[PDB]
Structure 1
């Protein structure tokens, strides 16, 4: 019979009040002999009716796939409200329900530290600028780099790593020409996390 998958919003969409987070309920392996699908949505057990269901789409394996999208409020998601998607179909002996929420647990604010290149690296043509983000909970987080009101995109960030105290840390590495570093430009590590003030902070790095 059919299977249901319930997907959370994109993490950045939950941390920027200007964006619109949504949860996505996908049903797959709907058959042609029973193609009719009913979604019901609940927020903390209270049925809501503002979801937007897309029309069925036949797949190449002779099944149907159908998606319903529920917009969630910025504050509702961060305050831990629970979103339940119930999918009903004439082939199911009982409806299928799935519930999802923001990662649970007491929040912990990141500490953000920028580290200049190692003295041994200063001999190369490019240098690594390092941003350590530690002590945060939950692990949902975004990191980017900027300089002079422009995105610096030659960077990579590690996944969050579970630290010994139950919080998370990561590192972000930005690679720049040694000349840019020596000329004194200011680089900034930008971090978005639920437990920061306005879910945002910035730390800068320069010679």
Structure 2
């Protein structure tokens, strides 16, 4: 009996691209159908902010409501480790609940990006696998794409980051392409977006 608060970070790709909207999301569950009103107060670094958008209530199968408020964050402030505080208040709730999240603490470290050509054994099939290995980056927030001839490349699949024993992360991306295109020596390119890279961006090409 009593509302509970969970505060979630922006998505990594949203934080690293100027055209997307990173946002912190304050979720409140277990709010009574009796008292269904919640008030949110948001503090960036202490300083209160007023442009947060609240969404409408939606009742769960639990017969309790879930109410959410999302706050847009400035790319830079997130990057520079500013604290985003969510205070919630409900009348079926004795004292306000506060939560604070932020960029992952710790020394950022630059990823190494390697491109691996298809295995000789895969040079059997109509389609081959182009591999991008991204290892040794901190924090785990990152974004990987593929391109060729200045155009995006659609069917790649990327693994989630995996924490290596030294405290950094690695992942792999697999872009599968028609072997006709690979055998022509067309140049494919693995794009990596990460806070620790110069201008937050690096490319690594692959062909022969």
| TM-score normalised according to structure 1 size | 0.93
- Residue 151 of structure 1 deviates from its aligned partner by 2.1
Deviation at 1:149, TM superposition (A): 2.3
Instruction: For 2:165 and 2:30, locate their aligned partners in 1 and report how far apart those are by CA, in whole Å.
Output: 42
User: Any idea what the Cα deviations from partners look like across 1:95-136, whole Å, max 9, x if unmatched?
Assistant: 111111111111011111111122232233222111111111
Report Cα offsets for 1:4-50 as digits up to 9, x if no partner: 22121121110012322111111122112222211111112222222
Q: Deviations over 1:67-116 (max 9, x none)?
A: 21211111100000111101111111221111111111110111111111
Cα distance in 1, alignment partners of residues 182 and 58 from structure 2: 53
Q: Distance in 2 between matches of 1:132 and 1:54?
A: 39
Does residue 149 (structure 1) correspond to residue 150 (structure 2)? The answer is yes
Counterpart of 1:7 in structure 2 is 8
Uncovered stretches (5+) of structure 2, i.e. residues with no partner: none
Cα deviation, residue 60, structure 1: 4.4
Q: Tell me, in whole angstroms, the C-alpha distance in 1 between the residues paired with 2:127 and 2:83.
A: 47
Comparing 194-203 and 45-54, the one that deviates more = 45-54
Pick closer, same or farther for the CA change 1:136–1:58 going to 2, 3 Å.
Answer: same
**Secondary structure of residue in 2 paired with 1:9:** coil
How many correspondences in the alignment?
A: 207
SS at match of 2:108: coil
Instruction: Name the SS for the 2:62 alignment partner.
Output: coil
Per the TM alignment, residue 58 of structure 1 is displaced from its structure 2 partner at its CA by 3.6
C-alpha distance 187-63 of structure 1, shift in aligned 2 (>3 A): same
> Contact 1:44–1:82 at 8 Å: present in 2 too?
yes
1:96 match: 97
Q: 45-54 or 93-102, which moves further after superposition?
A: 45-54
CA distance, structure 1, for counterparts of residue 58 and residue 116 of structure 2 = 51
Contact 1:16–1:199 (8 Å) recurs in 2: no
CA distance in 1, matches of 2:119, 2:19: 38
SS of the residue corresponding to residue 27 of structure 2 reads strand
| Distance of 2:111 and 2:91 partners within structure 1 | 49
